C-alpha cells in the first residue's frame, strides 16, 4: 500500500545517472519509434509491386516491354527500401545497446549507494529500535527489497518508454495514413484483447488451485492416513480405498465438465479474434475497391495500429515493476531518513580525560519498551566509589541487569540521571562512553574469524603482543595455545565449538584489550560449570584491580570480597553495606544466603494411459488437421493481398476478395470444432488416468506396513502432498502441452512443405536465418541466468556478513566497531558492484544483437525476395506467403521451448509415482495366503522375544520377553515405563515381526498365520480412540468388515459398552455424526464407542492399551466398569496404569528391560517384596496424600 514520491526514490542519482537515464530514455523512445516506421515502408513496397502487379497483368499484348520499366521501378524502389531497412537495423542496434546499457548502469550505481546507506542506517539505530522489531524480517527486508528497487529502476523503464513510443508512434502513423480504418479497428478493440487475455488466463490452469476440487478426497485420505493403525488393526482398507475411489469418481466428472467449458471458452475466444481480424480486413478491401485507400496503405495502418494497440498490453507489466519498487523503497528509506536520539555515529559531546570512575544513579525510574504494562525500576539511589567494586543482588525481575543496561546508555531513563564521575552520562560522547566502559555478559559471543581478530574487535589497532598479554592476563593463553593454529584458530556458530568458560575468557580478554576505566560484569560466572567457573573467576578478579566495577550474579561465592553489596525489592534499593553488616541486618541478602545455603525414460506411465487406445488418435489427428489448418490462414492472406496485387483487370477483384474473406472466416469456424476437440479429448483423458494413478498410489499406500508409516520421511502431510502433486503433475505432461507440440510440428510441417514447394531457394534461405536468431535467442537467456546465479552468490556473501552483524548487534554496539562492519560490508559489496558494471555491457550487446539480427534478417527477406527472385518469374504473392508460413512455424516452435520444463518436472514427479506402486512390504495384508485356523479358543505364547523398533535400532525395548496367558483369563501387565507394555499388543496384532524369538496364539506361530485373520480375532482398544466422520453406528460397525453389522447387534454392543445413555439421548440417535465435522463429544463417550467397536467384533482376545490414560473423576469409574464387564469372558491383556484396578487379575506380570521380572497373582506379588510392591505402594501413597 504505502508508496514513495518519485523524486525521493532517485535521490542517489546525480550527474551521470540522470544523463544516462536521459540519453537512455531518448534512445528507448527512438527504438520504440523504429518499429512502426518499418511497417510504414512495408506499404510502400506493396505499392511498388502493386503498380507493376496491375500493369503487368493489364498488358496481355507485349512481353519484352514489361521487362524494362517494371524491373527498373523494382530496381530503384527495392534498392531504396532495402537500403532503408539496413538503415533501421544499425539504428535499432545502437539505440537498443544505449537503452539497456545506460539504464542498467544507472540501476547499479544507485542500488550500490542504497545498500551502503541502508546498512549504515540499520547499524545507526538505537537498541530500543531493535527491541521492538524482528531482525530476521529486517535482514530479509534488506536483501529482498533492495532487489525489488533494483528491478524497479532497471531497464524496465526503458522498455516502458519504448512501448509507449511504439504505442504513440504506431497510432500516429495509423491515423495519419488514414482515419477510418483506425476507428474501425478501435471499434473491434473491446473484444479481441479481452479474448486473448482470457485464453492466456485459461492456459495457466496447471498451478495448484485444484485443491478446491481435490480437498474432498484429500480429507478422506488425510483422516485415513492419520488413523492408519486403526484401519490397519480393523482391516478396513478396502473400505477406505472404496471411499477414496468414489471421491475421485466425483472429482474426474467435475474435471471433464471444467475441461468442456474451458475448451469452449478458448475456442470461442479464438473465433472472435479470427472474426474481427477478418472483418477489419474485409472492410479494408471494401475501402480499397472504392480507390479511397491504396492496398499497401491498408497493411501499413492495420499493422501499425495493431502493433500500437498490443504495445499497451506489452507495456503494462513494467508499470507494476516500478510501482512495486516505490512501495519497497518506502520502508527502506524510512530507516535511512530516520535519525535517532542516541546516534553513536555522531562526533559530539565531551571526551573526558583522567576518568576516576565515580558512578552514581540518582532517582532513576525506568521501563523497557514494553512500556506502561510494567515499570521495573521504581525510583533508585546508588553510589559506587572510584576503585571500589559493588555487587548487586536480587530475587527476581533482573532489575539488577537494568543498571548495567543503563550504565552504557543503551536506554535513557524515564526520570532520573546516571552519572559517571561528576558529569551526566548524556553529555559525554556515546562511542567514547562505550569505549571507556568494558562489558562481560552471561552468554559470550564470538564472531567468525581468528582469535586474534576477535581480540582485535576490542581495538582495531593492536599487535599480537597485546593480544598475548591480554589473553595471558585473562589466563586464557594456555588453553588456546594448546589449540592448533595458535591465534589463527577459528570460532563461531560454524566450526570450533568450545567450552563456555573458554569463550567467556576470550570475551574477558577482548574486553581487557579495551583497557576500560569502568567494568560491568553481569552473570558472566553464572550459567557455567563449577570447575571452569573458578578458572574464569580468577580472570574476572584479575580483570579488576585497575578499574571501578559493578557486578551482578547469583553466585554469592564471588560477592563476599566486594566492598559494597546492594539489595533490591520491587525495583526499590534497600540494603547496602559490607557482608557482615548485611548478615547482621538479617534482611533479603541473609534470606537469599540461607535459601541458597533425474530425467530417464519412463514409458510405463504412458503404457498405463494405453488403457485408452482411443481418445488420443482423435486428439492428435484432430490437432494435426488443426496443424494443417493453421497455415491455411497464411495461404489465404497471401492470396487476398496476392490476387489484389496480382489482380490486373479490376472488375474480377471485388468478387474474389469476398470469396476469400468468406473462406478466411470458414477456417475460423472449423477451428472451433477442432480446437475444442483436441482440448476435450486430451482433457477427459487426463482426468481418468488421474483417477487410475491416485487410486493405484493410495491403494498401494495402504499395502505398506507400520514400519513404513513410522518413518520420519513419511508423515501424513508428506504422503498426501506426494499423493496430490505427482498425479497432478503427470496430467500436465500427458495433457495440453503434447497436443500443442504435435499441433506445432504439424503447423511448421505443412507450412514448410507449402513454402518449400512454392518458393525455390526462397525458403532455403529463410531456414538458414530463422534457426540462428532462435538459438541466438536461447543462448541469451542462458547468459542471463548465469549472471543472475553468479550475482546471487556474491551478494549472498555480503548478506552473510550483514546477518552476522545485525543478529549479534547488541554485542557489536557494546564493543562499537560498527564502522568495522560498515567497511567489511562495503568491501563485500565492491565485488558485485564491478560485476554490475559488466552486466550492463553484456545485457546491451545480447539485446541489440538479437534485435539487429531480426531487422537485418528482414532486409535479406525482401532483398532476395526481390532482385534475384523477382527478376525471375517467381512472384510476390508467394513471397508474402512464405514469410508468413515460415515465421508462423517458428513462432509455433517457440512453444516447444516454452513447454520444456513441464515434462522435466513431470518426469521427476512421475519418477516417484511408479516407485511408490512397486514398493513391496515385509508384511502384506493383501495376501490371501495364511492358515485361517478352525479352532476358536485363544491362548498367547510370547517366547524369548527380542524387539528393536525399525525407526530406532539403538535402545532395545524387548529382550527375551516370555509370556503365557490361558483362555478366558486376564493378563495384567505392569512395567517401569515405555512401550514395553504396549509392544506386546503391537506385536500380537503383528504390526512387526520381532528380531528374534516368536509368538503363538493357538499354538500356531502367528508369523506363518494369516495376517488379516490374526488381526480379525483381536479386540484392540487404545488410549485416544480415533473415530472417522460418519454415523456412530458406522463407527461401531467398523469393528467388523466384509460383512454389514446388524442394528440389534450394534445395539447389543452399545448396551455392553454402557454408552446407550448417550445414544438414546441424542436427537439423531444412532445416525448422529461424530468426528468434529458435525458433532463434539468428550473422551468418555468416544472410549465407550471404542469399547463397542471392540466387542461387536466378538473377539476372543481383548487388548486394553492404557484405555483410561486421558480421563477423570467418575468417567474413569464408568469406563472401568464397562471395560471390566467387557473382559472375564475372553482372553485379554491389560496394561492400564491404574494398579488399584489391576488388583483383580488372573496373572500380573512386571516387565523389566524387556525381560519379565516378577509375575504371579496379586497377593503373591504382594507376599513378595520388590518392584510390584513398590509400584503399588508409591501410587497408593499419592491417594492417601491428597486427603
Amino acid at each position: 500500500k504505502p508508496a514513495v514520491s518519485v523524486l525521493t526514490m532517485f535521490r542517489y542519482a546525480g550527474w551521470l545517472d540522470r544523463l544516462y537515464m536521459l540519453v537512455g530514455t531518448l534512445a528507448a523512445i527512438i527504438h520504440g519509434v523504429a518499429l512502426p516506421l518499418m511497417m510504414l515502408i512495408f506499404g510502400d513496397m506493396t505499392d511498388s509491386f502493386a503498380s507493376v502487379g496491375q500493369v503487368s497483368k493489364q498488358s496481355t499484348q507485349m512481353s519484352e516491354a514489361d521487362k524494362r520499366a517494371m524491373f527498373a521501378k523494382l530496381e530503384e524502389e527495392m534498392t531504396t527500401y532495402a537500403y532503408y531497412y539496413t538503415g533501421i537495423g544499425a539504428g535499432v542496434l545502437i539505440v537498443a545497446y544505449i537503452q539497456v546499457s545506460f539504464w542498467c548502469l544507472a540501476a547499479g550505481r544507485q542500488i550500490h549507494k542504497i545498500r551502503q546507506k541502508f546498512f549504515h542506517a540499520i547499524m545507526n539505530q538505537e537498541i530500543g529500535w531493535f527491541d521492538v522489531h524482528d531482525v530476521g524480517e529486517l535482514n530479509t527486508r534488506l536483501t529482498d527489497d533492495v532487489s525489488k528497487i533494483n528491478e524497479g529502476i532497471g531497464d524496465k523503464i526503458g522498455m516502458f518508454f519504448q512501448a509507449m513510443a511504439t504505442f504513440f508512434g504506431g497510432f500516429i502513423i495509423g491515423f495519419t495514413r488514414g482515419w477510418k480504418l483506425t476507428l474501425v479497428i478501435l471499434a473491434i478493440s473491446p473484444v479481441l484483447g479481452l479474448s486473448a487475455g482470457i485464453w492466456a488466463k485459461i492456459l495457466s490452469s496447471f498451478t495448484d488451485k485444484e485443491l478446491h476440487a481435490y480437498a474432498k478426497a484429500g480429507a478422506v485420505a488425510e483422516e485415513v492416513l492419520a488413523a492408519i493403525r486403526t484401519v490397519i488393526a480393523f482391516g478396513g482398507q478396502k473400505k477406505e480405498l472404496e471411499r477414496y475411489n468414489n471421491n475421485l469418481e466425483e472429482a474426474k466428472r467435475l474435471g471433464i465438465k471444467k475441461a468442456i467449458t474451458a475448451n469452449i471458452s478458448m475456442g470461442a475466444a479464438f473465433l472472435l479474434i479470427y472474426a474481427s481480424y477478418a472483418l477489419a480486413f474485409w472492410y479494408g478491401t471494401s475501402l480499397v475497391i472504392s480507390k479511397e485507400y491504396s492496398i499497401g496503405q491498408v497493411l501499413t495502418v492495420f499493422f501499425s495500429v495493431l502493433i500500437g494497440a498490443f504495445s499497451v498490453g506489452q507495456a503494462s507489466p513494467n508499470i507494476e515493476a516500478f510501482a512495486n519498487a516505490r512501495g519497497a523503497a518506502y520502508e527502506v528509506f524510512k530507516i535511512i531518513d530516520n535519525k535517532p536520539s542516541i546516534d553513536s555515529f555522531s562526533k559530539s559531546g565531551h571526551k573526558p580525560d583522567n576518568i576516576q570512575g565515580n558512578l552514581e544513579f540518582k532517582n532513576i525510574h525506568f521501563s523497557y519498551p514494553s512500556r506502561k504494562e510494567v515499570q521495573i525500576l521504581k525510583g533508585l539511589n546508588l553510589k559506587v566509589k572510584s576503585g571500589q567494586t559493588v555487587a548487586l543482588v536480587g530475587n527476581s525481575g533482573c532489575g539488577k541487569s537494568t543498571t548495567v543496561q543503563l550504565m552504557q546508555r543503551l536506554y535513557d531513563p524515564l526520570d532520573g540521571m546516571v552519572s559517571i564521575d561528576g558529569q551526566d552520562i548524556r553529555t559525554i560522547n556515546v562511542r567514547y562512553l562505550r569505549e571507556i566502559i568494558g562489558v562481560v555478559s552471561q552468554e559470550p559471543v564470538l564472531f567468525a574469524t581468528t582469535i586474534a581478530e576477535n581480540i582485535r574487535y576490542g581495538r582495531e589497532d593492536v599487535t599480537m603482543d597485546e593480544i598475548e598479554k591480554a589473553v595471558k592476563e585473562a589466563n586464557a593463553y594456555d588453553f588456546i595455545m594448546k589449540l592448533p593454529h595458535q591465534f589463527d584458530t577459528l570460532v563461531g556458530e560454524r566450526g570450533a565449538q568450545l567450552s563456555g568458560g573458554q569463550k567467556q575468557r576470550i570475551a574477558i580478554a577482548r574486553a581487557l584489550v579495551r583497557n576500560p576505566k569502568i567494568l560491568l560484569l553481569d552473570e558472566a560466572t553464572s550459567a557455567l560449570d563449577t570447575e571452569s567457573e573458578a578458572v574464569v573467576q580468577a580472570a574476572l578478579d584479575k580483570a579488576r584491580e585497575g578499574r571501578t566495577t559493578i557486578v551482578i550474579a547469583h553466585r554469592l561465592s564471588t560477592v563476599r570480597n566486594a566492598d559494597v553489596i546492594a539489595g533490591f525489592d520491587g525495583g526499590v534499593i534497600v540494603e547496602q553495606g559490607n557482608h557482615d553488616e548485611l548478615m547482621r541486618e538479617k534482611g533479603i541478602y541473609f534470606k537469599l544466603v540461607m535459601t541458597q545455603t533425474p530425467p530417464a525414460s519412463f514409458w510405463r506411465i504412458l503404457k498405463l494411459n494405453s488403457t485408452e487406445w482411443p481418445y488420443f488418435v482423435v486428439g492428435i489427428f484432430c490437432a494435426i488437421i488443426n496443424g494443417g489448418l493453421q497455415p491455411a490462414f497464411s495461404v489465404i492472406f497471401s492470396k487476398v493481398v496476392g490476387v489484389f496485387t496480382n489482380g490486373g483487370p479490376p472488375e474480377t477483384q471485388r468478387q474474389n476478395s469476398n470469396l476469400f474473406s468468406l473462406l478466411f472466416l470458414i477456417l475460423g469456424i472449423i477451428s472451433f470444432i477442432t480446437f475444442f476437440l483436441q482440448g476435450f479429448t486430451f482433457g477427459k483423458a487426463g482426468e481418468i488416468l488421474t483417477k487410475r494413478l491416485r487410486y493405484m498410489v493410495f491403494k498401494s499406500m495402504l499395502r505398506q506396513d507400520v514400519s513404513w508409516f513410522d518413518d520420519p520421511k513419511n508423515t501424513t502431510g508428506a504422503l498426501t502432498t506426494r499423493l496430490a502433486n505427482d498425479a497432478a503433475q503427470v496430467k500436465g505432461a500427458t495433457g495440453s502441452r503434447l497436443a500443442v507440440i504435435f499441433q506445432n510440428i504439424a503447423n511448421l510441417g505443412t507450412g514448410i512443405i507449402i513454402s518449400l514447394i512454392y518458393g525455390w531457394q526462397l525458403t532455403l534461405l529463410l531456414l538458414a536465418i530463422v534457426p540462428i536468431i532462435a538459438i541466438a535467442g536461447v543462448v541469451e537467456m542462458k547468459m542471463l541466468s548465469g549472471q543472475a546465479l553468479k550475482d546471487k552468490k556474491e551478494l549472498e556473501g555480503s548478506g552473510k556478513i550483514a546477518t552476522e552483524a545485525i543478529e549479534n548487534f547488541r554485542t557489536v554496539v557494546s564493543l562499537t566497531r560498527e564502522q568495522k562492519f560498515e567497511t567489511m560490508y562495503a568491501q563485500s559489496l565492491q565485488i558485485p558492484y564491478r560485476n554490475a558494471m559488466k552486466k550492463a555491457h553484456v545485457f546491451g550487446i545480447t539485446f541489440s544483437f538479437t534485435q539487429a539480427m531480426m531487422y537485418f534478417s528482414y532486409a535479406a527477406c525482401f532483398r532476395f525476395g526481390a532482385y534475384l527472385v523477382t527478376q525471375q518469374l517467381m512472384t510476390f504473392e508467394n513471397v508474402l506467403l512464405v514469410f508468413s508460413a515460415i515465421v508462423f512455424g517458428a513462432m509455433a516452435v517457440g512453444q516447444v521451448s516454452s513447454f520444456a520444463p513441464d515434462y522435466a518436472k513431470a518426469t521427476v514427479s512421475a519418477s516417484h509415482i511408479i516407485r511408490i506402486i512397486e514398493k513391496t512390504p515385509e508384511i502384506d495384508s493383501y495376501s490371501t495366503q495364511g492358515l485361517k485356523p478352525n479352532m476358536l479358543e485363544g491362548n498367547v505364547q510370547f517366547s524369548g522375544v527380542v524387539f528393536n523398533y525399525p525407526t530406532r535400532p539403538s535402545i532395545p525395548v524387548l529382550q527375551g520377553l516370555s509370556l503365557e496367558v490361558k483362555k478366558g483369563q486376564t493378563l495384567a501387565l505392569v512395567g517401569s515405563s515405555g512401550c514395553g507394555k504396549s509392544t506386546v499388543v503391537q506385536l500380537l496384532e503383528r504390526f512387526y515381526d520381532p528380531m528374534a524369538g516368536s509368538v503363538f496364539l493357538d499354538g500356531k506361530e502367528i508369523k506363518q498365520l494369516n495376517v488379516q485373520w490374526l488381526r480379525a480375532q483381536l479386540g484392540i482398544v487404545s488410549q485416544e480412540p480415533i473415530l472417522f466422520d460418519c454415523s456412530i453406528a458406522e463407527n461401531i460397525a467398523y469393528g467388523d468388515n466384509s460383512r454389514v453389522v446388524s442394528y440389534e447387534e450394534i445395539v447389543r454392543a452399545a448396551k455392553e459398552a454402557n454408552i446407550h445413555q448417550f445414544i438414546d439421548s441424542l436427537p439423531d440417535k444412532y445416525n448422529t455424526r461424530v468426528g468434529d465435522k458435525g458433532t463434539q463429544l468428550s473422551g468418555g463417550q468416544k472410549q465407550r464407542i471404542a469399547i463397542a467397536r471392540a466387542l461387536v467384533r466378538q473377539p476372543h482376545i481383548l487388548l486394553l492399551d492404557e484405555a483410561t490414560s486421558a480421563l477423570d473423576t467418575e468417567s474413569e469409574k464408568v469406563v472401568q466398569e464397562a471395560l471390566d464387564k467387557a473382559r472375564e469372558g475372553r482372553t485379554c491383556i491389560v496394561i492400564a496404569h491404574r494398579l488399584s484396578t489391576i488388583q483383580n487379575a488372573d496373572l500380573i506380570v512386571v516387565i523389566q528391560n524387556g525381560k519379565v521380572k516378577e509375575h504371579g497373582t496379586h497377593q503373591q506379588l504382594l507376599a513378595q517384596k520388590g518392584i510390584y510392591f513398590s509400584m503399588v505402594s508409591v501410587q497408593a501413597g499419592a491417594k492417601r496424600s491428597l486427603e
Binding site: A196, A200, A269, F270, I273, Y274, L306, F310, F633
Partner: peptide, 6 residues
C-alpha cells in the same frame, strides 16, 4: 496463435 498474439 494466429496473428495478433494467441
Amino acid at each position: 496463435x494466429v496473428x495478433v498474439x494467441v
